[PDB]
């Protein structure tokens, strides 16, 4: 008969709204008691009478789900629903602790709340009943103790009711009457917030606009309290950033920066949070990261600091200038952030950024020589913008070489901090050399020569565009250096980049021989570069299977010579992974 | 191609090559005795049959061993007895003279073809025959 | 067009029925002076 009544519900829509409201009115007239319970509360209730009431709430749920647009709603059905919900609350909170009929009437009450939320799920902007405050005060006096009750990952009876009441136009009258956002914000600022906290945050972010478009001054102060909740909930959207739904945070922070500027410490906290929005997770997308940096700039245009947020915005621009993502949109937002950071370093940054980012002109090569002849003492964002131009951004090749040489000149004129800046230059040149670049690899080689300012002739002859006598002199220089972990790793990386699967050129056997000779000359340095030799042999072993295995086989055979010389010298090690790699070679032998 | 379980090649045959002249020479040069009966006990029907041949007393010993071993008398199964007992006793009185069967001397069956002249150790190399001697 | 329209002669239907001589109770002259037009 459940399947039969489900068929009756699936065919219970064929009659008009008059007959649907008449059948709903007959369903309401079972145990309404509007003479007894339309004033305040009910007169009496029973277990089987609540079972008629639980069945009435279930029939209301089935009728609303069947006719989930119109539902034939009536104030008699509303009064019967309020009488049933109040009788469920009264019986559950007035019965003794025996829990059988109490849990029956509690699962009657949760299902009746689900059927009540179904009415607003079906007929939301259709009725908008003007006597809402009766049921609103009834449900408030029932669920006053539901302060932090709806704070969970699945608690969505009163949380969904609050979201429905907040996502309307004029049904927020019961919200702005006394309180909805107070208890919602209490459970939102609860510290054990699960991932419905983002749902409540998006609901309040969408519901601040109705409280702002409302002409009532009470709703204006409630919108002020929603901005105050956005300022007092400065840990929830931080700690709940476990998914890629950071567009809600970027949509609230832009709304907050466009709406309310209430404290300089609040603007500094917003700028530091949007700095953590780019220094917290690397999976933030382009529009979200651009709007987050623009919201940090919008808080900085109002109430920024002069030293602390100055350095924070300078670090933000020093990351965003190395990024420059999304076809110069992030570069334009980074130029705006550097012009809003309000320092002397930021002033030189905005000058040397606007003088180069003038919409694809020769002003980039003009401004590189301009700041070279007029070298600025900030130099951090200058080295960022001149190392993005030294990377695989095609123009400013000689200007990139002059920028690296001028950074070396400043690092020699310092004579400590600018040597740690040269450490960052070397840690950038390492990832530049281990890459598929052509102009930026030559620029990193020029930076290696400027850091080297026999060895200088070796570097300039490795970057000589000749490659036959040049590679012969490189092999002879490796022989002279044989007769350095990261340094020889960088040299062998540049050599492997110049002979990296370029099988349209000859002497690849001597090129791999020079790679293995530099690897042997690094592996002779056992006290330092044994780890680097192990890493280079490991990367060559990964390349021995990664889609190409002709010259990598001879690289494996000639990197075995370091092991042969080490075993002849030993005449303790790690035999285990060596034997397992021997088993892997035996498996590659059965290919 | 592929393997196929062959009981006819891991079954104990040992009878294609069992020749009575070779077996008699082995019994002569055996240097361990032969379990012969007390002399009257092996004649059969008061002399109406033969004595009994060596294969017949071997088969009789096997039948009595199986007999005592699983407690069952053998039977008078008609088709097998009308073949084997009558044909066996008629060739017994044909060829068994005084407890000795002379049927083989009247039978064409080459000794060296099947039972001598080893097939696995054929030694078809001068080096293999040299290593087989030394 | 393989099995489609085999113009062959088939065995059991070659004498399945038998004709009739007079046939139509009308005359062929009655056909001609029936649908001249």
């Amino acid at each position: 008969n459940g399947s039969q009544s489900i068929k009756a519900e699936d065919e219970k829509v064929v009659m008009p709204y008059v007959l649907r409201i008449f059948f709903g009115r007959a369903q309401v007239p079972p145990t309404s008691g509007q003479k007894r319970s339309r004033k305040i509360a009910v007169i009496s209730v029973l277990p089987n009478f609540k079972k008629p009431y639980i069945n009435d709430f279930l029939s209301l749920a089935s009728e609303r789900l069947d006719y989930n647009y119109f539902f034939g709603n009536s104030h008699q059905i509303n009064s019967s629903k309020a009488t049933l919900k109040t009788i469920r609350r009264m019986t559950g909170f007035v019965n003794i602790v025996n829990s059988t009929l109490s849990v029956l009437r509690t699962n009657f009450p949760l299902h009746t709340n689900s059927v009540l939320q179904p009415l607003i799920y079906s007929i939301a902007m259709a009725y908008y009943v003007l006597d809402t405050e009766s049921t609103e005060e009834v449900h408030l006096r029932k669920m006053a103790s539901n302060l932090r009750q709806q704070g969970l990952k699945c608690l969505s009876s009163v949380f969904e009711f609050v979201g429905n009441t907040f996502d309307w136009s004029t049904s927020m009258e019961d919200i702005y009457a006394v309180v909805v956002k107070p208890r919602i914000s209490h459970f939102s600022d609860e510290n054990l917030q699960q991932p419905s906290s983002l749902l409540r945050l998006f609901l309040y972010w969408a519901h601040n606009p109705s409280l702002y478009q409302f002409l009532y001054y009470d709703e204006f102060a409630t919108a002020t309290a929603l901005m105050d909740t956005i300022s007092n909930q400065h840990v929830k959207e931080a700690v709940i950033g476990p998914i890629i739904e950071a567009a809600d945070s970027i949509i609230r922070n832009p709304v907050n920066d466009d709406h309310y500027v209430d404290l300089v410490t609040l603007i500094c906290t917003s700028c530091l949070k949007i700095l953590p929005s780019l220094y917290v997770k690397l999976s933030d997308s382009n529009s979200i990261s651009t709007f987050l940096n623009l919201l940090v700039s919008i808080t900085e245009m109002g109430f920024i600091q002069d030293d602390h947020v100055r350095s924070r915005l300078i670090s933000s621009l020093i990351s965003i200038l190395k990024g420059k993502l999304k076809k110069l949109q992030e570069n334009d937002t980074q130029k705006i952030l550097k012009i809003l950071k309000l320092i002397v370093f930021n002033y030189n940054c905005s000058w040397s950024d606007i003088e180069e980012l003038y919409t694809t002109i020769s002003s980039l090569f003009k401004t590189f020589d301009e700041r070279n002849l007029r070298v600025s003492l900030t130099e951090l964002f200058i080295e960022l913008g001149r190392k993005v131009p030294e990377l695989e951004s095609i123009s400013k090749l000689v200007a990139d070489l002059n920028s690296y040489s001028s950074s070396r000149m400043h690092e020699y004129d310092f004579p400590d901090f600018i040597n740690e800046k040269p450490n960052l230059n070397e840690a950038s040149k390492s990832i530049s050399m281990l890459k598929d670049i052509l102009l930026p690899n030559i620029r990193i080689g020029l930076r290696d020569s400027l850091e080297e300012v026999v060895l200088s002739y070796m570097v300039k002859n490795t970057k000589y565009f000749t490659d036959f006598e040049d590679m012969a002199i490189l092999l002879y220089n490796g022989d002279e250096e044989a007769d350095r972990r990261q340094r020889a790793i960088k040299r062998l990386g540049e050599h492997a980049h110049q002979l990296k699967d370029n099988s349209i050129s000859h002497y690849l056997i001597p090129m791999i021989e020079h790679y293995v000779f530099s690897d042997d000359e690094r592996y002779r340095n056992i006290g330092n570069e044994t780890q680097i030799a192990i890493g280079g042999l490991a990367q060559h072993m990964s390349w021995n299977q990664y889609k190409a295995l002709l010259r990598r086989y001879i690289s494996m055979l000639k990197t075995k010579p370091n092991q042969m010389k080490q075993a002849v010298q030993l005449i303790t090690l790690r035999i285990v992974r060596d034997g397992a790699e021997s088993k892997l070679t035996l498996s590659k032998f059965p290919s | 191609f592929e393997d196929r379980f062959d009981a006819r090649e891991h079954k104990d045959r040992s009878n294609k090559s069992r020749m009575q002249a070779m077996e008699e020479y082995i019994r002569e040069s055996s240097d361990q005795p032969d379990w012969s009966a007390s002399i009257g006990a092996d004649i059969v029907n008061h002399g109406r049959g033969g004595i009994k041949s060596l294969r017949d007393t071997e088969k009789e010993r096997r039948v009595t061993s199986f007999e005592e071993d699983n407690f069952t008398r053998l039977n008078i199964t008609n088709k097998a007895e009308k073949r084997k007992q009558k044909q066996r006793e008629r060739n017994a009185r044909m060829n068994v003279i005084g407890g000795e069967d002379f049927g083989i001397f009247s039978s064409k069956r080459k000794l060296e073809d099947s039972t001598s002249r080893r097939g696995a150790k054929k030694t078809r190399s001068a080096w293999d025959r040299a290593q087989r001697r030394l | 067009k393989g099995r489609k329209l085999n113009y062959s002669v088939q065995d059991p239907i070659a004498n399945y029925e038998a004709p009739i001589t007079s046939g139509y109770k009308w005359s062929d002259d009655q056909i001609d002076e029936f649908f001249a037009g």
């Binding site: - | 592929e2 379980f5 009981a7 079954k11 071993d69 699983n70 407690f71 | -």
Partner: protein
């Protein structure tokens, strides 16, 4: 009318006992009548082996299973209550069913080759063996042709033997049926003559199939005891 595996003497009868259906196949099993009556000879005829089956002395795989033609296949531990008879029967080197005598701590378990692992219904991992013990929930690293160890009091897998290069394997099938020694070679082809190869006294070589071979332990330590000569 007999197979080769039963070690059945020819001077027995005319009709050979077809085993009934059961765990193993017809071609890889011996029933209880050919086990008890005419191999280790606890009976003399079918009447009295049915009599002791009605008396229920047999306790194969820890359950009684009173039936004459019950197909005891590979290493089903035949247990007999009187004189505490524990019999694990394996293959010899020439194709028959060598029934080794074992003790109680060894007959408290058996082992079984896994045939397939399934996501059958309702998220339940799943394992079958040659007696078809559909036991719940092994680890995800049960490949085909590994070896579970059944509990034989409940049904649970207690130990697990992984099939890889360097494991002690038993071959039941084809022209290698019943050999042990498991190491000269490994060769996994792509559809046939794919195996791990088995030594001899002079360490000779052999070819078989994957499904016709299954692991029993390690190089020197199988927890099955084996007969000798």
């Amino acid at each position: 009318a007999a197979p080769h595996h039963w070690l059945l003497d020819k001077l027995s009868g005319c009709y050979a006992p077809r085993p009934s259906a059961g765990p193993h196949k017809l071609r890889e099993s011996l029933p209880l009548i050919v086990f008890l009556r005419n191999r280790l000879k606890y009976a003399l005829n079918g009447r009295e082996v049915k009599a002791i089956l009605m008396q229920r002395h047999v306790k194969v795989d820890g359950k009684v299973r009173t039936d004459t033609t019950y197909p005891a296949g590979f290493m089903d531990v035949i247990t007999l209550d009187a004189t505490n008879e524990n019999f694990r029967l394996v293959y010899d080197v020439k194709g028959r069913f060598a029934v080794h005598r074992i003790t109680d701590e060894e007959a408290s378990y058996k082992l079984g080759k896994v045939k397939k692992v399934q996501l059958g219904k309702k998220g339940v991992p799943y394992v079958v063996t040659h007696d078809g013990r559909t036991i719940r929930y092994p680890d995800p690293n049960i490949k085909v042709n590994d070896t579970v160890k059944i509990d034989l009091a409940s049904g649970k897998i207690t130990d697990f033997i992984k099939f890889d290069a360097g494991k002690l394997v038993y071959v039941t099938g084809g022209r290698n049926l019943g050999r042990i020694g498991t190491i000269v070679h490994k060769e996994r082809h792509d559809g046939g003559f794919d195996l791990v190869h088995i030594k001899d006294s002079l360490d000779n070589t052999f070819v078989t199939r994957l499904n016709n071979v299954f692991v029993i332990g390690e190089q020197g330590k199988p927890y099955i005891s084996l007969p000798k000569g």
